[PDB]
Each structure stands twice: as C-alpha cells, then as structure tokens.
Amino acid sequence: MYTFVVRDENSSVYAEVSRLLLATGQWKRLRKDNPRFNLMLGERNRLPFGRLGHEPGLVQLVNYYRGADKLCRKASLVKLIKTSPELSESCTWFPESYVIYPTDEREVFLAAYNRRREGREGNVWIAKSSILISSEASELLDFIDEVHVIQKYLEKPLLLEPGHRKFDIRSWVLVDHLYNIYLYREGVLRTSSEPYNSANFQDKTCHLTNHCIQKEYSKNYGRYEEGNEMFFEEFNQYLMDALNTTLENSILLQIKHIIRSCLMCIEPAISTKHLHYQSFQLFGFDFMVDEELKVWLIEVNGAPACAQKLYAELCQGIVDVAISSVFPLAPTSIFIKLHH
Amino acid sequence: MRECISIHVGQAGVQIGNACWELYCLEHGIQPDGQMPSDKTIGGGDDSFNTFFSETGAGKHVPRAVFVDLEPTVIDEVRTGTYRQLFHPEQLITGKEDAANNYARGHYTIGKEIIDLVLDRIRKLADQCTGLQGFLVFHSFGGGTGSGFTSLLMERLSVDYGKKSKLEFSIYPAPQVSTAVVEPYNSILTTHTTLEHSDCAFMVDNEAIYDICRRNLDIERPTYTNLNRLISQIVSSITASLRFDGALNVDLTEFQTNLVPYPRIHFPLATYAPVISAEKAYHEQLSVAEITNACFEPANQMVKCDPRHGKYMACCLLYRGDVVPKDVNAAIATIKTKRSIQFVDWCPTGFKVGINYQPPTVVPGGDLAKVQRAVCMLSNTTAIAEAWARLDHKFDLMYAKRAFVHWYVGEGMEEGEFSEAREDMAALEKDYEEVGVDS
Amino acid sequence: MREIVHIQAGQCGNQIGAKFWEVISDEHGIDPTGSYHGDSDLQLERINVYYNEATGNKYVPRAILVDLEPGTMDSVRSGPFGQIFRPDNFVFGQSGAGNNWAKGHYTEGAELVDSVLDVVRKESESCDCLQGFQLTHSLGGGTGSGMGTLLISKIREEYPDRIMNTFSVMPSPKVSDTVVEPYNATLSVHQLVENTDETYCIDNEALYDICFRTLKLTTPTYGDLNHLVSATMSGVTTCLRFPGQLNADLRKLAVNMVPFPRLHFFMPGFAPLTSRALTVPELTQQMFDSKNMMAACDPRHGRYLTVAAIFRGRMSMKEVDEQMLNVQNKNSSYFVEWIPNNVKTAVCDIPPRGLKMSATFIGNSTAIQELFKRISEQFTAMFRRKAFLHWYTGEGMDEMEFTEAESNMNDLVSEYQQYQDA
Amino acid sequence: MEVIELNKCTSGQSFEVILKPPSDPSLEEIQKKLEAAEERRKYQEAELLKHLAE
Numbered sequence A: 001m002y003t004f005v006v007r008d009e010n011s012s013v014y015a016e017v018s019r020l021l022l023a024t025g026q027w028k029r030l031r032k033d034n035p036r037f038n039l040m041l042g043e044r045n046r047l048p049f050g051r052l053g054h055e056p057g058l059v060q061l062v063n064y065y066r067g068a069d070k071l072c073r074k075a076s077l078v079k080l081i082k083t084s085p086e087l088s089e090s091c092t093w094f095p096e097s098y099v100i101y102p103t104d105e106r107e108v109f110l111a112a113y114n115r116r117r118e119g120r121e122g123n124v125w126i127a128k129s130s131i132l133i134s135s136e137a138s139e140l141l142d143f144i145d146e147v148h149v150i151q152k153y154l155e156k157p158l159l160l161e162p163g164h165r166k167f168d169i170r171s172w173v174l175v176d177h178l179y180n181i182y183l184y185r186e187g188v189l190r191t192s193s194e195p196y197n198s199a200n201f202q203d204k205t206c207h208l209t210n211h212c213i214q215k216e217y218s219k220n221y222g223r224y225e226e227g228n229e230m231f232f233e234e235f236n237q238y239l240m241d242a243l244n245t246t247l248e249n250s251i252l253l254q255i256k257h258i259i260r261s262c263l264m265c266i267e268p269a270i271s272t273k274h275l276h277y278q279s280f281q282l283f284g285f286d287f288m289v290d291e292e293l294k295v296w297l298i299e300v301n302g303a304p305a306c307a308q309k310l311y312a313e314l315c316q317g318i319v320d321v322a323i324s325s326v327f328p329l330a331p332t333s334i335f336i337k338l339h340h
Numbered sequence B: 001m002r003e004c005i006s007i008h009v010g011q012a013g014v015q016i017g018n019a020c021w022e023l024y025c026l027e028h029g030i031q032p033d034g035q036m037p038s039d040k041t042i043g044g045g046d047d048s049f050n051t052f053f054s055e056t057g058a059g060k061h062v063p064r065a066v067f068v069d070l071e072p073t074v075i076d077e078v079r080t081g082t083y084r085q086l087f088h089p090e091q092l093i094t095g096k097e098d099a100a101n102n103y104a105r106g107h108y109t110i111g112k113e114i115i116d117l118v119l120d121r122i123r124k125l126a127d128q129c130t131g132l133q134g135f136l137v138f139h140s141f142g143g144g145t146g147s148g149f150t151s152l153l154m155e156r157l158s159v160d161y162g163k164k165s166k167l168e169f170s171i172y173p174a175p176q177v178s179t180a181v182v183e184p185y186n187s188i189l190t191t192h193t194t195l196e197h198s199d200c201a202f203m204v205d206n207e208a209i210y211d212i213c214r215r216n217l218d219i220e221r222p223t224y225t226n227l228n229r230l231i232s233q234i235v236s237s238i239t240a241s242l243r244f245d246g247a248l249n250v251d252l253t254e255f256q257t258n259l260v261p262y263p264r265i266h267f268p269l270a271t272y273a274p275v276i277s278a279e280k281a282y283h284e285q286l287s288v289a290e291i292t293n294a295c296f297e298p299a300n301q302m303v304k305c306d307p308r309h310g311k312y313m314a315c316c317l318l319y320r321g322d323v324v325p326k327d328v329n330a331a332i333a334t335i336k337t338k339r340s341i342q343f344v345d346w347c348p349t350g351f352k353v354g355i356n357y358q359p360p361t362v363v364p365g366g367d368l369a370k371v372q373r374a375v376c377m378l379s380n381t382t383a384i385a386e387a388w389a390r391l392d393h394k395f396d397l398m399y400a401k402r403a404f405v406h407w408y409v410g411e412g413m414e415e416g417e418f419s420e421a422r423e424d425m426a427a428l429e430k431d432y433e434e435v436g437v438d439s
Numbered sequence C: 001m002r003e004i005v006h007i008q009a010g011q012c013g014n015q016i017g018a019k020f021w022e023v024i025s026d027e028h029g030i031d032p033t034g035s036y037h038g039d040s041d042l043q044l045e046r047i048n049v050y051y052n053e054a055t056g057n058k059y060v061p062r063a064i065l066v067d068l069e070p071g072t073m074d075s076v077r078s079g080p081f082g083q084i085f086r087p088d089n090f091v092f093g094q095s096g097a098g099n100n101w102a103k104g105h106y107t108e109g110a111e112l113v114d115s116v117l118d119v120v121r122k123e124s125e126s127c128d129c130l131q132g133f134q135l136t137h138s139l140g141g142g143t144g145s146g147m148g149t150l151l152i153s154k155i156r157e158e159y160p161d162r163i164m165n166t167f168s169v170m171p172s173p174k175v176s177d178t179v180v181e182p183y184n185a186t187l188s189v190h191q192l193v194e195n196t197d198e199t200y201c202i203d204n205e206a207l208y209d210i211c212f213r214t215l216k217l218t219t220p221t222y223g224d225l226n227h228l229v230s231a232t233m234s235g236v237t238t239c240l241r242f243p244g245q246l247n248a249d250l251r252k253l254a255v256n257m258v259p260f261p262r263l264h265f266f267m268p269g270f271a272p273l274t275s276r277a278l279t280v281p282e283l284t285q286q287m288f289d290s291k292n293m294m295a296a297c298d299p300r301h302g303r304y305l306t307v308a309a310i311f312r313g314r315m316s317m318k319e320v321d322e323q324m325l326n327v328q329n330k331n332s333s334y335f336v337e338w339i340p341n342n343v344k345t346a347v348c349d350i351p352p353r354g355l356k357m358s359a360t361f362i363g364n365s366t367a368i369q370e371l372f373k374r375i376s377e378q379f380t381a382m383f384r385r386k387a388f389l390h391w392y393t394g395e396g397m398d399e400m401e402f403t404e405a406e407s408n409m410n411d412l413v414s415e416y417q418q419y420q421d422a
Numbered sequence D: 001m002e003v004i005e006l007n008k009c010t011s012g013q014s015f016e017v018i019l020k021p022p023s024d025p026s027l028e029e030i031q032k033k034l035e036a037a038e039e040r041r042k043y044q045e046a047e048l049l050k051h052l053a054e
C-alpha cells in the first residue's frame, strides 16, 4: 500500500487522479500535513519543496517542477525567451512582447512602436498580467501602473467557416520524473461562436478566446459544436476539406517544436535526475494560428484544467506514465513522446 | 606563525575530533607516540604545521586541542586509544553525568559547574601561543552538551577572547542517525545563543554524509566511524590552508572575508568530491573537469538543498593533489555554460581557487580510496536556508503543543527563550529571503 | 549516569524481581554463587549498572528486597538465585499488609520504611554516579502498592534530582485475589502520576490473555505470567545493560519518551512469545500487534505519542530499518503528526535465554487510558456505595482521600484524550 | 573571464578567477542569566520539598 497527500482542493485534474489512485486498491490518502508520503499532490502556490525528500525510507514524488513558474508566469516567460542564449533572436514563433511595471522596458517598448506607426503594418497591442486591448499606447498604460506584459496582438488570425470566427489551441504536456516530454494526442480548440470583428477598435467579445469568458459575454454558445470546444478529429477534417492540409503537417509539427524548445531550455534549472525528491508536472500550452498557418505561443499554463470528456483518458495516462513509473502496481500509448 | 586552538564538545565533537587529529597526524607524518622524523627543528621552529601542533623538548608533537564532554566514556576512548600519547591529560576534560539531550541541562545546570574549568585549560593552551588566531569548535546541534555547553562556551570565549576568530563545525540532526526526538529544540536554542558569537559555521547534515557513504562507498549501514572519516576529509580540506604552506585561506580571517559578507549569514555549503570506494581498487581517476562538476550536484553536498533555487554570495574552491590553474579555468568555463550558477546582484561572480599539491591522505584499511586529486567547494548560497526551514517546521510542530518543554523548564529555562530563539530563526529565514530573491 | 539501585516490594514485586535477576544474571554470565563464568565481553562492559564488585571477582546485585511479611522473602532466599543477594539487603516485617493500601502506606509500612531507606542510602553512597531507582511491585495488594508508593515519595525527598522508574503490575478480575484491588490501584496510580518518571504498565489481564489465547494454557500459574514479565523486563533494560550503539541511561529514556510530565505510563510488548527461527518482518509485525502488548489496551483505539523498539540478536540493520519504517509509514494514522520522528530503534547483538533473536516494544500510547478507565469503573462501582471502606477508614483514612484519587485518575484519562484528538 | 593574483610555492598555488563584475552581551549578564536559572531550579525544588513535607 502506497501513500499520498492532497494539498489542492479545487484541482479538477488531480482530484480525479486522487479518485483513480483509490480505484487500484493500492494507494490510500493521508491528512495533508502528514510528512510520511510517497506522493504529494501539492498546493499551487508556495509548495514546500525544501521539506521534500528528507523523510527516511520513503521515495517522495510531487506533481510540480520547482521553478517551472519561470515558463508559466507571463512576465517571466518573456524574460526567459529574451535572456536565453538558446531561444532569443533565433526564435520567431513567440510574439515579441515587452514588460511594464507600476529595471523596466519603458525604453524598449517605444522603439518598435514608432516604425510600425510609420509603415502600413498595424500597431495593435494586447495588455495582460501573470484584460485590456488598444491601438493607442495611452489607453493601456492607465490601469497598468496601479508583473505586466504588452504582447503583439495577432490582427491576422486563421478563420473557421462558416462564420469567420477565432480560436486558440490548448495542448496538454506531461513532463515525467525522467524528463520525458509527453504530448497528449487529443488537444482542444477554445473557439468563439460570435464572428470576428476588424474595424471596431474597442469591442472585446470575439477578440477574447476563452471558454469561461465566452459564456458570460455571449448567449450564442454554438450549435455546430458543443460547447465552444472543437477536437482533433473535426479540426483535421475542416483543414483537409477547406485548406487541403492535415492537422499534423500545417500545425502539429510547430506545436511539438515549441513544446521542445520551451521545456529543453529550463531542463538543467528544474530537472530532478540526481535530486533527493522526484517531480513530474502537467502543463497546458496555449497556441494561436495565423492566416498563413504559422503557430504562435501565447501562454504556458502550469496548473491546467482538462476538457470534460477527456478527464477519464488523460488522468489514467498521468497515473500510468508519471506515478506508476516510480511506484509500480501488480497500450495504445495515449501520448506522443517528444525527445528530450 | 599564528596558532589555532581546536575545542571539541560532546560525543560528536570528540569522535570527529579523533578522526581529524588521526588524519592530521598521517598528513604531516606524525606518529602515534608524537615523534615527527621530518621535523628537524626540535622543541620549536614555527613551521606552517605548528599552527595546530606545539612541541616539547623530547620531540613530541602535541595537538592544540581541548576535548570536553559531560560524561567520561567517549573521552575514555581517547585516553585508551592509539593516540593517547599524543594528548597531555590536562587537554582531556570529563564530567560525571551528561546533559540527557537537553540544551537547558547542558547550558545552565551542568555547564555552569564545569565552564570555569574548561576556560582554564584553554587559557593554558592560549598562554603558550605567540600569536593566536582563534578557535575551531566541533559539536552537534542535537546533543545536550553539544548544544547547551557549546553555546555557553561561545559566549564566554567572546568575553575572554574578544577580538579572536571563532569557527564552527556543526553536526545538523538527521533521523537516520537516530537522534533524540527533542533535537529540533536543541538545534534552534543553540543556534540563537551562538549566532552573534560565531564568525563562520560549516554545517554538516548527517543525512547527506550517511547517503554519500551509502551511495558512493557502497556501505549497507554506515557507522559513526564511516561518517567521521568522511567528515574529517572535509575538515582537513578546509583546515589544510592553515596547516600547510600556501597563499589562500591561509589565515582564519580570510574565510570570514571571502565567504561571509553579511555577519549573520555565515553558513557556507561544503561540497566534496570525489568520494570513492576502496573495493574499487583500480578506479579510473577522475579529472579536474569531473570533480569540479561534482561540486554542483546536490548528491555530494554536506547539507541537502538545491543551489539552483537561490543565489551565491561567494564561491571558493579548495583543490588537493595533481591540479594546476589551467585545468580549473577550463573546468570552470565548461561548467559556466552547463549549470545555472546564479550570483547575487551586489557581489562579484567569481571563484577564489586554492591548490595544495600534497594529495588527500586516507586511513589505512579505511572505506575511502586513495585518490590523486580532490576538491572541496565552500559556497555561501541562500539555498542553505532550506535546512533551517525543515528544522524550524519540526520545532513548530512540537512547540505548538508545548511537547517536551517541561524538561527544559525543569532545568531553569523559560518558555520565553523558546519563542525568542524561534523568532531569531524566523528573522534568519527572512534574511536569506531578502538576499536570495529579486522581490 | 552509571549505577541503578533496584527495589522490590511485596509478594508480586519480589517474585517478579527474583525472576528478573535470574534472567539478567544468566545473560551477563553470573552463576548463583556470584562468580562470572561467561564467554563474551559485550557481559562485563556495563555490568556495574546493576551489580556491585566485592572481592574475589564476585558480582552481587544492587537490589533491596522489601516485604511486610517474611514468607515471600524466605522463598526468594530458598530459590535458585537466593545466594546471590546481600543478606543485610533483606528488610522484612512480621505483621503483613492484608492487601490494604492504608496499612502499607500509613500504619504498618511506616514502621519498616526507615530500615529500607538505610539500605537504599548505604547502596547509593557507594555509587560512583547514581542514575536513579527502579521498583518492581503490584498495585492491587498492600505492601507493594502502599509501601512501594511510600518508598517512592521518601526516596524522592532524599534524592529529588534522580530518576524514579517502576514496573507496576495492574490488577484484573481474571487474576484477582481480593475485591479491594481497584481501591489499592487507584490510590497508587495517583502516587505514580506525581512521583515517577517512567512506569511500565504490566496488566495481569494481558498476561493472562497472552497465556490463555496463543501460548494456549488453560490454567496459568503466576510463574507463567512472570515468565512474560521477566522477558519484558530483560528487553526494556537491554540498552541500559549492554553497550548498544545507542547511548543509554534512564534520564535520556525519560526525556524522549515523556512529552508531558503526567503522561509517563508505557505499554510494553514482546516477540516472540515463549515458554525454531524467526525473521525480521515477523518480529516487527508481532511486537506492534495488540496480542503481544503487556497492557490490555488496543493501540488502534488511540495514538502513539512516542515509541521505543529494541531488537536483539544478530540480524540485518538494513532489514530492521526497512521493516520499522514499513510498519510506521503505512500505519501513520496511529502516530501523532506533531512529534516528528517519534519511533526509534536500537539493536543489540546478544539475544536473550534460548532465542536466536527477539524484539521488545515500549510505547507511550493514548490507548493506555482504557486501562485506567477499567480501574476507574471497578473503583466507582464500589465507592458509590462506600463498600469495603471500613478496612481503610479503620486505618485512619477518610472518604475525601479516595474522592481525590478518583478525580486525579479521571483527569489523567481526560489528559490522554486531550492529546489523542490533536 | 580572467585570472587575478596568482601566488605560488613548493607546497601549492592559488588564485582568483572573476567572471562578471558587481553592481553584544557582557560577563555580568551571562552570570546573571545563569544564576536566574539556578534560582528558578531552587524555587521549583523548594516548592517540592514543601509539598513533600505536607
């Protein structure tokens, strides 16, 4: 009988893992402040990594990489991409963002802005923190100044028909204790059922790509798919019929590349090869796709929720490859293995 | 020549003391009886090795050392063992009944009766020093004598020897070693009382020493003799600069100058390599590149923590054996790009390097192997704070219920001293936060 | 912390005490004449903890035999190791105690107590450094219950900074002699709460159940019960008696096992249960089992504050640590999470007589309240109707002293429950 | 990366290699606090021997 502890009450992914571990008849739950465990399903903020791997006899695992917040915080992501000698300059897939604070990039933001205002290439920028949009620099800076980033807004997204509507692609990545990167073959597109506007420089409905924020602001929740979530069998078929390409070629090679480059960069800082405690983590990469079928990274989510129907398969994948790899019990791989 | 007196308090201090002075004797070519054939200056000479050894007219080389314990059986092994002729009887001091793993008992009750005796025997050694530097205090955080009496001694040494240096070699408690249940109290009570009075403190987590003996030497269950012989190599690598001729770490004040910018933040992380098994009788000799690489692996550290999640204030490399500057510079440049060595913004991101061509000696028939080059990295990193956080959490759990407090109150200590000492550790944890992050 | 002075009071205390000296003399290689004829030296290393050295390499126990009637102490002298004891350490009265706490504590025992203390002082003066005292006695009778607790109080007055250890045998209706044992026990438990550092609760109910169920004896004598006690007493004193890697005296045991002053009533255990070879997993499984506990209390109904294991015999230290951590980590609900690292283990190479290896358990469990509740109910059943009080009030006591002792033991039960729910 | 102040001898050598540039109690109180513990022990012993005399 193995032992684990739950320190995140509202983790829909790891509450399901907790229930699936109990289904084996070989794991059992302790109270959260009991140190005598094999597996920590830790809290999302201020997880005590310093106190892990010191209890004698117990091989201790945890579901978060320490310092993976480097990738997942929006401001730290921009600092990482720019300062890294493995990504900056060479990289193109990231929209070149700038950090603002209430050292700072007051100096750097206005360098690129001016030559865009001269030429025909548009000058729209989106503001966000670790939800405002404007063409002018004045209308963004007010709420900002009392971790904040200004990213290049994609004015030329790929459109879904019928309707000329916008989407963002969510793909789940599981990095295990050996740092084997596993991409879940079923992804999801958080679409927007309201058509995309262009000349309107103030509206923020279709412009926002979420599932939850698309619930309140829009009554039309889509009859062509349900809810605002499109899956890999349908989107592949749409691309083949409309654009004459598969999901693999046009988009998925770029996703697997961006996942590699981001995770391989932080590897020597976060990895637990020769460490007193092991660790895995589930990441949720968010992507955009422009009208030339180039994929752009938006945000890496360090503690992501899954889609409703995919909870059963994915959480079983988590316990198979991440947990049971370290703690064996007594396929059809549901993941694609990216190297490293 | 400037002398160095080495004080040994409690069981851990004495038994580690035995390992160190056994080793020192083999490194300098001093025999058990005290004769040193290499030494041509009889009854003096003020060589580099004379910083640790005084001389008599008969040609005996006597450790500048004082062994103290509140019970006799541990120091009786010194009196009966192979190096009995090394020490004069006045150096070895023993009480009747011990501190029973109680700081309050070792500090207040029993310590008070023996403190004036111990300072008198230290004064006997100090009176025969032409130019004394300071002290090297060996003890445990967990032991009643090692926690209680040491902190009393460290207070009295600040009065009686005000300007002198005070270095600590502290054994941090580990439940594999079988400690007492109240060692988290003893560790925090003694750290509070000693913090103002110690200049530089080399913590040694028994967990790390135990697991290094398990992992590298392939020992099923490491004894204290296994732990102490490994620990004495690190102590030897640290103290080597005082005992041998060179031009780095050559005086005890340089450790303070180099490694300790903030006076309270005086706990450097020791990292030693290579640790090799004697069963591997022919092993493939590790290069300067490899052993310097091993100094950034958590497995080889003295305290288990992650330097990657923290910031270096100082970093200092002490090589022993077949090494030259070109090899170290090549190793540092290779390691520079590979590892994530984050330094603080307000310090120069450099490495102070020292080489002593005499390679690391080992005890004949020991579990350690004789190698041709080794390194000890002393590095003041904020990741050491993890060790305080673990220990402060164990304190809080018991102290929330007043568990075991009556034993300390029964010896004259107050409940105020627990919360006083804890708030200083809370302040110390906050000091490592301020230094170790950008915000 | 070197020498220990043994005392044995009453019928039970002397019979158990005599068996304890049989066992440890055999382990230390001391024959009935007091001469050392042994093979190893891992026997003489800490022999002076329990023995004095007379001339001619004679090893005489540091033991004091006490009783209010001479019958039981004459039987000890006639027994197998009766030669070994000092003749002037036999302190005995003629009247007897009549299974009355009041007679042992106040009237009959008060005459004899000065003669005991003279022998205690004579033994303590010759000690290089006295650890403290250990007492063997029952709480159901008169002498061992009443005079033993009087001795404890008087010894504390004269030696207030020394450790006071006890092996207290609790009464049970299954092995009861008199109906007034709950009175005698309740009065003594109140004394033990104040004036002892460490008490080993040896319940006769448990000893009977261990003999009846398992072992499988339809008719157990006191000899059968005492076989388990002498085995347990050997086990718990192993770290005091031999040079185990663990540094070991009575004060250190008290410092680590006693988180709060009043809660020092331990629950001993043993494995294997004896009257042919056993592995480390099987030892570790047995010692924690309720059927191997010498106090009749289910440890699953409470929580362990502190635990102390002593494995004996030549076995793998790695396999011990794995199995102890196996039991500990995977039954972690029954240990308190607010005392980290509260289970410790010691290993001694020399096994007990006639076993290759064994394991002794010492536990400060909150489930010990079940024992004190059982006596409290037996007490209160009689006390509510003032039944059998004329025996005690005839010796000068009154009802208020009984009322206090009842309240004090119910506070002790309430205090164990306080820390069980934390 | 550059090496500064290299020193040498027959026993060994040493140097610094920079990589990036930068940007109490008294004896009275001790013996006071020790004797305060002694008095609290003597107070706790006094209340015991008082209580034992009762």
Ligand SMILES: Nc1nc2c(ncn2[C@@H]2O[C@H](COP(=O)(O)OP(=O)(O)OP(=O)(O)O)[C@@H](O)[C@H]2O)c(=O)[nH]1
Pocket: B009, B010, B011, B012, B013, B015, B016, B069, B070, B071, B098, B099, B100, B101, B102, B140, B141, B142, B143, B144, B145, B146, B147, B171, B172, B173, B174, B177, B178, B179, B180, B183, B206, B224, B227, B228, B231, C247
């Ligand atoms: N490395 C090492 N650690 C030791 C040794 N002896 C004891 N320890 C550790 O030190 C702590 C116990 O301290 P001791 O030195 O035995 O106790 P003490 O200072 O003599 O104090 P008292 O025994 O109460 O007088 C435990 O955490 C042990 O793990 C040793 O020889 N080597």
Ligand SMILES: COc1cc2c(c(OC)c1OC)-c1ccc(SC)c(=O)cc1[C@H](NC(C)=O)CC2
Pocket: B177, B178, B179, B180, B181, B182, C236, C239, C240, C246, C247, C248, C249, C250, C252, C253, C256, C257, C306, C307, C308, C309, C310, C341, C342, C343, C344, C345, C346
């Ligand atoms: C008298 O012999 C004993 C000595 C000790 C102990 C002891 O009991 C095993 C002993 O009884 C067998 C001892 C007991 C129990 C605990 S559990 C809280 C404990 O933490 C610490 C000890 C101490 N040290 C170790 C390593 O276990 C004190 C020493």
Ligand SMILES: Nc1nc2c(ncn2[C@@H]2O[C@H](COP(=O)(O)OP(=O)(O)O)[C@@H](O)[C@H]2O)c(=O)[nH]1
Pocket: C009, C010, C011, C012, C013, C015, C016, C097, C098, C099, C100, C138, C139, C140, C141, C142, C143, C144, C145, C169, C170, C171, C172, C175, C176, C177, C181, C204, C207, C222, C223, C225, C226, C229
């Ligand atoms: N285990 C054990 N219990 C005993 C023995 N003799 C008496 N008892 C118990 O102790 C109680 C009576 O105490 P006893 O020692 O006879 O009276 P005392 O001589 O006046 O102290 C009863 O509850 C008995 O069950 C014995 O040899 N072994």
Ligand SMILES: [Cl-]
Pocket: B160, B161, B162, B163, B164
């Ligand atoms: Cl001075």
Ligand SMILES: [Mg+2]
Pocket: B010, B011, B069, B071, B098, B145, C247
């Ligand atoms: Mg000691």
Ligand SMILES: [Mg+2]
Pocket: B039, B040, B041, B042, B044, B045, B046, B047, B050, B055
């Ligand atoms: Mg000389």
Ligand SMILES: [Mg+2]
Pocket: B158, B162, B196, B197, B198
């Ligand atoms: Mg100072």
Ligand SMILES: [Mg+2]
Pocket: B109, B410, B411, C161
């Ligand atoms: Mg005292």
Ligand SMILES: [Mg+2]
Pocket: C111
């Ligand atoms: Mg009379």
Ligand SMILES: [Mg+2]
Pocket: C114
């Ligand atoms: Mg008299």
Ligand SMILES: [Mg+2]
Pocket: C011, C099, C141, C177
């Ligand atoms: Mg009877």
